[PDB]
């Protein structure tokens, strides 16, 4: 068979995975949702597009688990986003009753998935859907950090004039305050962004800006869009891992990963660089931390225990 | 410069545009709309995913039309859809007003460009686009065929068993009860789909029944969707278009082109198989009809004459 | 495990194979050849390639077939090319040991493997090394007309100035004057040659010559290079049967083929337009021939039929 | 017009340039030599491999330089290779020679080129070639460094088990023992070579021993060739340099550029980091070495400052 890719949720992040997945030939799409119509509809869509550039891929819609069966790989967009006037609690509420629907379809009907998690809140939802669905931890992995690292690419090749493949951007922890950036291993050609500000190819003040820039970049999105929130890049991000995965191409992807004791946490997801392989994470690297780095972490990984003991407090089975 | 590329309309069509331009690496990107906002979202969006594939492509949201100066590829998806309620003739008024404003700002400040029209009715709108822009008949094209193309060929691809990029269709004319399908000018590997019910292959029901399946193929997408019409298909069908202009490729696509006699028609854009070049439309492919074809290309002409005339009486500049 | 494809033979097809190969993402790649030196060091440069575009593939060298086990596709160019002083015989008996040895490769470890032969003559050959490996006669094909369809594809696309991607090229049998072109089912946008004749887009001297110059065509690049033969479209055709194996296209491509009485004939590879995808040969496309198309395909079977005498007459195991 | 590439030489890695342009759509190529026959045979084969992937790109064959009119970029392979029984001199001595040669035709027919050499020895034929035509200095540039680079981030990929994608070297200076390695700024995924040694994730030992395989890189594959030298890598590497140029990408790769005192060095081309866009070499990236470095490259720059020499000592022009 060629490789099966469900998506969980068909809303604009949903569509856009099951487009590039046709684009870069990773496989048949099904596309699931609650209500029929717009799975199947998007799904035809993208099929009916097919012919033009000649990708081979089967497309279906559904609203049952049962057309999940056998997927290489899921990847989770469903539940409701943070609004303007719902709490945190109310956000987790409705997402982990998501998350156990998602855990026990995914539980029966594709065993063997590695499952990529883009529900909010992304460290929590992760680890919800890892213990709802009993899947083997280093199977089961959130996108965040290669979002992050795609815009702080994306102004740093503005900043330098220079193609966005020769930048590389460390970023651990989650998103906005939480985001823990390493400007010293963040890189244009090999050269640390530190020393391009001691060579006078940026200041320190830019340097700082394109970091609050990455924190806050998520809101620009849904500040310039008004209705709804960024799709290309979230969805380009999980792609790209999900493609380390069906190819075994063994990516460097920062993710939010289950820790068995790398970086001092047991227990928790957290976004820290993966190799992405065939058989799901295969390694966690875990760096060397300067002062104010090993800081902004902790807090982070506080940011997360709170998080954690929010759902807990409201799910037994958690 | 690389080659620029200005989307006139940042709704589900233009942002795929967008999107697809960054992929396949066509050149920069200005995303035009009325209201500020959404064209700067998408442009951002996009290109804060391009890190991950690698595409090095200016993006930029915009409404002033002096931000698609020297484009050399403008898509028109501006104006509105057929409602439940509105008449012809309102979609007619609302939507020729669109295209004198569009027309107008192609004329000051991309009057070089190649134009591909996405707005409905179609072989009416890009009519009065060229008029109103001033620009070159074979400058201006609207895209119908190669969509209506695309769903034919998916329908074939399914029914045979066989890759797409094996599939050929042949279209003539617009959408719809105006579609002019050539079954014996589609084939697989070479074989017409005429001789593929002679071989068993398939039947002559089934065969009209995809020929039906694409006549219906917009409605049953919108039907799908609940809100809202197809728009990977149709965003692949006009890069294509894009694409054999800017590469030069001379592609042999359905597209609605302006008649200087071919087909027995002078002044009308119709739905025919154009080469497509640096210089625009370069050629027009005009096939011998049997009778029940030219019948059928005579009603779909005479529909398209109809919309000209109602055209015409809504607005005195045509 | 990624897709692992083998190749039986090092030379200037076989490391355009493993370059191809490794660009499009196939798999994993080992070189096989009778001597160490050429496969590694082929390999070794191909590995090193590879970081500029970003494929992540395996790459090896080997002299012993225990390297090929597991092979999902095996690509067979070994042997001798026809010299200017050596009969068919001579040839044959050459190209005959080493299928042997070839075959018994397969056999021991990679039975499963899909195998592409492209060792002269190329209807023997294949006949031979399908018997001496064993395995199903829909796994072991043999690339020919892939070949003469894209150097068709190419004259015509000159002539009519048209795109590549636009024209269809319909051969069987097998190369020179064994090749059986079906004029009517080539077409340029679906509308076949002969019908663009009489529209005055080419001559009927012009189709003809174009027709034997694909007959021809494969000399004419041995009295232009004068050491050695094709290599790139030979190798891009075999790669394109290769996809469609390894991602279960379902391409319709014309390959030599073994015949369980499709055309007629039982018992013999045939150049016949084939479905392939993940269970190999799956379908043949058996046209209704014209007059002179039966007496060319006959001909050119009896031709067939001729070299597998030949073959018999020296090797008992045949 | 479609961008205009022309190769100097068509020998294998001229064939493996002309076949990655097409394959990767860059334009039209010519393909030139001194002798017909070869490069309108590689020419014909690769333009006959197209339909199969679905390139339109133009390939020619010349034996005069009026061929290369217009060329957008100029790829310089024409020369012999050090034999194993011929001095410095005389290679500097016949190779000189070539360059005079093509350095009129560029002169003559493509004097707006950007030209990228890849005759031997690299540093001083580039000095050479842009001295005879007469070209900006931004627009000559050498391959050298790209392929150091590949070869020492597949090595990296291999000993770390990750993806190509994820590795950067950072080289400046030549081959072999004028390279000059900086292990500091390269890296996986951020994570510099040096602080991956004190993680454990390889040992110095290991580390010195993959730069040392970089230096004799070149030697390895020719001691598995037996005949000839590599040029898969070679090839891919300056492509990637002729699409930086072509697309305005903004590249940042080590190439042999001229300098204009960047590393203290006026009036040389030396192996630095460049910035390749639409302009050519836009900048040069001068980092701050530490002492080793310093004295490593002064001794490289030394080297090349000796063949320039023992150019002079040969060519009254120069
Ligand atoms: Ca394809
Ligand atoms: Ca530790
Ligand atoms: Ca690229
Ligand atoms: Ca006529
Ligand atoms: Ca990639
Ligand atoms: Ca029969
Ligand atoms: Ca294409
Ligand atoms: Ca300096």
């Given at each position: 068979?060629?490789?099966?890719?469900?998506?969980?949720?068909?809303?604009?992040?949903?569509?856009?995975?099951?487009?590039?997945?046709?684009?870069?030939?990773?496989?048949?799409?099904?596309?699931?949702?609650?209500?029929?119509?717009?799975?199947?509809?998007?799904?035809?869509?993208?099929?009916?597009?097919?012919?033009?550039?000649?990708?081979?891929?089967?497309?279906?819609?559904?609203?049952?688990?049962?057309?999940?069966?056998?997927?290489?790989?899921?990847?989770?967009?469903?539940?409701?986003?943070?609004?303007?006037?719902?709490?945190?609690?109310?956000?987790?509420?409705?997402?982990?009753?998501?998350?156990?629907?998602?855990?026990?379809?995914?539980?029966?009907?594709?065993?063997?998935?590695?499952?990529?998690?883009?529900?909010?809140?992304?460290?929590?939802?992760?680890?919800?859907?890892?213990?709802?669905?009993?899947?083997?931890?280093?199977?089961?992995?959130?996108?965040?950090?290669?979002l992050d690292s795609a815009r702080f690419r994306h102004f740093?090749?503005?900043?330098?004039?220079?193609?966005?493949?020769?930048?590389?951007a460390?970023?651990?922890?989650?998103?906005?305050?939480?985001?823990?950036?390493?400007?010293?291993?963040?890189?244009?050609?090999?050269?640390?962004?530190?020393?391009?500000?001691?060579?006078?190819?940026?200041?320190?003040?830019?340097?700082?800006?394109?970091?609050?820039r990455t924190?806050?970049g998520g809101?620009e999105i849904?500040?310039?869009?008004?209705?709804?929130?960024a799709?290309?890049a979230?969805?380009?991000?999980?792609?790209?891992?999900?493609?380390?995965?069906?190819?075994?191409?063994?990516?460097?992807?920062?993710?939010?990963?289950?820790?068995?004791?790398?970086?001092?946490?047991?227990?928790?997801?957290?976004?820290?660089?993966?190799?992405?392989?065939?058989?799901?994470?295969?390694?966690?690297?875990?760096?060397?931390?300067?002062?104010?780095?090993?800081?902004?972490?902790?807090?982070?990984?506080?940011?997360?225990?709170?998080?954690?003991?929010?759902?807990?407090?409201?799910?037994?089975?958690?």
């Amino acid at each position: 068979a060629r490789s099966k890719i469900a998506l969980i949720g068909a809303g604009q992040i949903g569509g856009t995975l099951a487009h590039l997945a046709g684009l870069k030939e990773l496989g048949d799409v099904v596309l699931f949702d609650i209500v029929d119509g717009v799975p199947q509809g998007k799904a035809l869509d993208i099929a009916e597009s097919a012919p033009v550039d000649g990708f081979d891929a089967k497309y279906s819609g559904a609203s049952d688990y049962s057309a999940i069966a056998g997927a290489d790989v899921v990847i989770v967009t469903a539940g409701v986003p943070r609004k303007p006037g719902m709490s945190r609690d109310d956000l987790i509420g409705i997402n982990l009753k998501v998350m156990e629907a998602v855990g026990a379809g995914i539980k029966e009907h594709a065993p063997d998935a590695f499952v990529i998690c883009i529900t909010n809140p992304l460290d929590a939802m992760v680890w919800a859907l890892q213990k709802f669905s009993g899947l083997p931890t280093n199977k089961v992995v959130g996108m965040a950090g290669v979002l992050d690292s795609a815009r702080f690419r994306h102004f740093l090749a503005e900043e330098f004039g220079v193609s966005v493949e020769d930048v590389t951007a460390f970023v651990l922890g989650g998103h906005g305050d939480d985001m823990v950036p390493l400007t010293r291993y963040s890189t244009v050609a090999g050269v640390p962004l530190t020393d391009l500000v001691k060579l006078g190819w940026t200041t320190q003040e830019k340097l700082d800006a394109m970091v609050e820039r990455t924190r806050k970049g998520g809101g620009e999105i849904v500040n310039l869009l008004k209705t709804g929130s960024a799709f290309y890049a979230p969805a380009a991000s999980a792609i790209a891992m999900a493609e380390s995965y069906l190819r075994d191409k063994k990516r460097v992807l920062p993710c939010a990963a289950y820790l068995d004791g790398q970086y001092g946490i047991d227990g928790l997801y957290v976004g820290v660089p993966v190799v992405i392989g065939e058989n799901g994470v295969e390694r966690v690297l875990e760096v060397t931390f300067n002062d104010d780095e090993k800081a902004m972490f902790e807090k982070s990984v506080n940011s997360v225990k709170g998080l954690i003991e929010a759902c807990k407090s409201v799910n037994d089975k958690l």
